Structures are given as C-alpha cells and as structure tokens.
Amino acid sequence: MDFYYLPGSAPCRAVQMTAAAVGVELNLKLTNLMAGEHMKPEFLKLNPQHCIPTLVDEDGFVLWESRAIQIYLVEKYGAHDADLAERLYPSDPRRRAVVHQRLFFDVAVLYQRFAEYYYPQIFGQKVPVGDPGRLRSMEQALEFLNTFLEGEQYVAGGDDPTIADLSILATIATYEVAGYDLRRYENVQRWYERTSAIVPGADKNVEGAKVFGRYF
Amino acid sequence: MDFYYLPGSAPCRAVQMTAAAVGVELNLKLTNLMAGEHMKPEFLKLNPQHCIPTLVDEDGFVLWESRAIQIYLVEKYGAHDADLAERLYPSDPRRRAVVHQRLFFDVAVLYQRFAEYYYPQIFGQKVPVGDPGRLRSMEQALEFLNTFLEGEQYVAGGDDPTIADLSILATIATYEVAGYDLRRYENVQRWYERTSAIVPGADKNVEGAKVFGRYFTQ
Ligand SMILES: CCCCCCSC[C@H](NC(=O)CC[C@H]([NH3+])C(=O)O)C(=O)NCC(=O)O
Numbered sequence A: 001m002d003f004y005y006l007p008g009s010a011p012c013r014a015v016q017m018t019a020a021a022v023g024v025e026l027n028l029k030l031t032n033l034m035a036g037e038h039m040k041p042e043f044l045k046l047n048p049q050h051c052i053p054t055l056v057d058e059d060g061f062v063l064w065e066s067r068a069i070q071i072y073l074v075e076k077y078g079a080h081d082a083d084l085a086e087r088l089y090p091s092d093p094r095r096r097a098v099v100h101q102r103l104f105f106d107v108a109v110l111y112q113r114f115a116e117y118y119y120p121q122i123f124g125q126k127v128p129v130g131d132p133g134r135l136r137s138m139e140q141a142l143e144f145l146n147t148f149l150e151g152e153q154y155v156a157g158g159d160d161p162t163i164a165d166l167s168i169l170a171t172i173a174t175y176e177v178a179g180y181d182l183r184r185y186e187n188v189q190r191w192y193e194r195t196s197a198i199v200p201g202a203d204k205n206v207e208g209a210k211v212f213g214r215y216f
Numbered sequence B: 001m002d003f004y005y006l007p008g009s010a011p012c013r014a015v016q017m018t019a020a021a022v023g024v025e026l027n028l029k030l031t032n033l034m035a036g037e038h039m040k041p042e043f044l045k046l047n048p049q050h051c052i053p054t055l056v057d058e059d060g061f062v063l064w065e066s067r068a069i070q071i072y073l074v075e076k077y078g079a080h081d082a083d084l085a086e087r088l089y090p091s092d093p094r095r096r097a098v099v100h101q102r103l104f105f106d107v108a109v110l111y112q113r114f115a116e117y118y119y120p121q122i123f124g125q126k127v128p129v130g131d132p133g134r135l136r137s138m139e140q141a142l143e144f145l146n147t148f149l150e151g152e153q154y155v156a157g158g159d160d161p162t163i164a165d166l167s168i169l170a171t172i173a174t175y176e177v178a179g180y181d182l183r184r185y186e187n188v189q190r191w192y193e194r195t196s197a198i199v200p201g202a203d204k205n206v207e208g209a210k211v212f213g214r215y216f217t218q
C-alpha cells in the first residue's frame, strides 16, 4: 500500500496513526510539494486533485482525503479485528454520526481556520502578523472543541479513541507546534496530552508536527 | 424530527433532498441567522456550534453537519429499504470511500471555495469585486468536479445518484444562483441538469437556491 505523504502534513499524520492502529504497514512515498512532485503526471494520473495524503492500495485503487482514507483503512483493513473496528469507528448510527460530524468539523472548521490564520504567516507572502478576525475565528473553533470535550474523554464520545480523535490529534499537534497556547482551552489540552500518551503512532504525530514547526 | 434550517442554505437543502429520498418528513423550523436565532440559549444547548442545518431526532438526539445528517438519515431511516440505502450509500468499502471523498471534497473544497470567493461580496463589508486568487481557486474546484464527472453519470461513480450527488447538487445550485456560468464546465452542467430532473427533493433544492439569490440582486 503506497502512501504519498509529507511528515509535516497533519492529514498525512492522521492516516499514519490510523494505519498503525489497524496494523497496516504503509509504503512511504515522500512527495515533495515545494519541489512540485504532486504535479508530475504519475501523481496526477493517480490523483487529478494533486493532493497528499494519497493512498494506492493492493489493487491500484487510489484514494485521497485523509478522513476518507481513515474510514477505508478501518472498514477494509481493520475488519479482521472486529472489536478494534468497532472502537475506532463505532457502527451504531448515532455514535457513528457524531464521529462523522467531528471529522467534518476537523476538515471544515478546526484545521481550515488554523490554515487561514497561519498559512499567510508561514507560507507564500509570510505576513508578520496574523489577521485579528482570522484569529478570533480560529479561537472560536478551539472553543467549539473545548465544549465538545466537556465531560468527555474523547472528541466524539465513547470510552476509546475513534478515528475522529486521531484526525483531530493530527490537527491539534499542528496548533501546538505553531505556538498556540492550548492551555487556554482546558478540555482540549487535557484531551490532547492524554490521547497523545495512549494512541499508537502518536510518536510519528509529534515528530512530523515538529517538522511543520520549522515553518515558525 | 425537528429541522432547524433556512431554504437558502446549501447544506440545509442537501438534507432536504436526502430526507425526501429516504421518505422522512422534516418538521421545518426557520432559523434566522441574521437575527441571531441560532445564538439563543436554547439553541446553543442543542448545538453549541450554532449552525444550520440542525436535526433533532425522535429521541432528542441532536446532529449537525449536513453530510453527517445525510449519512445518518440513510443508515437509520433509509436502510429499511435495503436496495434504496445501497443506491444512496453503497456499502462496499471501495465504493463508499469514493462517496466519502466526494462529500469531504464538497465541504472543504467546492462549497468552501464558493464561500471564500462570494461571501466577502455579499456579506458584511460587501467588496464590489471578488478576489482574483479566490476566483482562480474556485474555478479549480469546478475543474476538479468536471474531471470527476468525465465519462461518468454521477459524482462518485455508480449507476445511481448517491448522497454525494445530493450534497454537491445543493452546492452547485448555489453556484448557479450566484451567476457563475456553469456551461464553462460541460460535465458539471450536464450532470447538474440530469440529476435535477431525477432526484427526490430537487424542487426544494431549486426553490431554496433561488431564495439564496436574494444576496446577489446586484
Ligand atoms: C509540510 C508542510 C506543508 C503543508 C502541508 C499541508 S497538507 C498538503 C495539502 N494536502 C491537503 O490540503 C489535503 C487536505 C484534505 N482535506 C485531507 O485531509 O487529506 C496539499 O497536498 N496541497 C497541495 C495541493 O492541494 O495542490
């Protein structure tokens, strides 16, 4: 299973943690976006959206969007351990719906607002000071997550980390290395430190996040 | 099942089409965002993220994010018709993964880039011209969609529309009412007209998108 990735990339790290969780060994194919590797035909042919992470399975099926890959890894490759699949991706429609909402929250709100605030400062033009409005918006997302975590060990509830935790862990590790004071959000910090301690492959998460940290 | 919504809202319309597809009646509850109705304490208690659509089921279970609601509607309320659920949301992990990718594409790329380009023009400050970079990015998303649809009837493949078609249909109807010329993207236009002519709730989608046009009278 080929895995087109960068360690700094949060969505890549989310897949790496999920692959570790289900015992899938990824064949790592470092894909240098700064060089322009993702715009080479061999990547474009596989993925016309030219984005990482991209997974290519045993049969040549190509998949992207980290959170879609996460689900695929559990459904297909995690299936063999039924209690494991149920922990990572509970099948009850209500429980699963919360997992889904947290995944969409991560892509569309939590990580999105992180990117809109920080990317202008660290990429492209590299603006000295972040936008006050984009900052308030990002803080609102952290406040949402803090609220989700009130009286809850994990982001989507349950007694074990789900793929939503793994996704949001990749995101929040990126906040940390960006130098955002996560201790302002008590539930987020508590969840972050505890889940990082227990989730397999969280090492790669912190290590890769440190790579992203080099932009700051 | 209570449905906190506005007809103009694309994600609300995606839920409307999905509920129609699975034969679920929504108790419609207009929620005026400009009026701060989503910020009332009782609403925040149901949904601290204060966003629409919000669905409250028969047991008081509260759910938001339209695409999570779409999946929930199929699994809990559509699945009694096994064939119908399989069409809307195929269970084979490979086939389902493409459906999931398209749903995530819709929220994070297609609709997101629509919002980033048009919202500054229609909300708050109301800038007389859209940002060129944001326009290029939005066109790129339409280009991606057009490519997905090359030689295919539906967004995630298959012989029938899925929940991904319904979600992206709500988004593209919003492109249309914004005045974007979709004939620039032949596969998108072809798919849009065809799917609008066949799916349940397409009436709600077009009527609601027309309402969103209230922001684009200039
Ligand atoms: C090492 C730090 C560099 C910044 C890392 C950002 S992640 C790279 C980016 N990937 C994505 O935005 C994928 C997002 C998608 N929502 C997912 O979760 O997979 C990309 O391939 N962008 C290129 C493109 O889309 O063309």
Ligand SMILES: CCCCCCSC[C@H](NC(=O)CC[C@H]([NH3+])C(=O)O)C(=O)NCC(=O)O
Residues within 6 Å of the ligand: A108, B008, B009, B010, B011, B033, B038, B049, B050, B051, B052, B053, B064, B065, B066, B067, B107
């Ligand atoms: C402000 C209106 C913009 C025009 C209509 C956009 S849809 C309304 C908007 N809805 C959402 O943020 C939900 C998006 C979510 N991704 C989904 O698909 O459900 C909202 O409730 N926004 C208010 C909020 O989140 O506080």
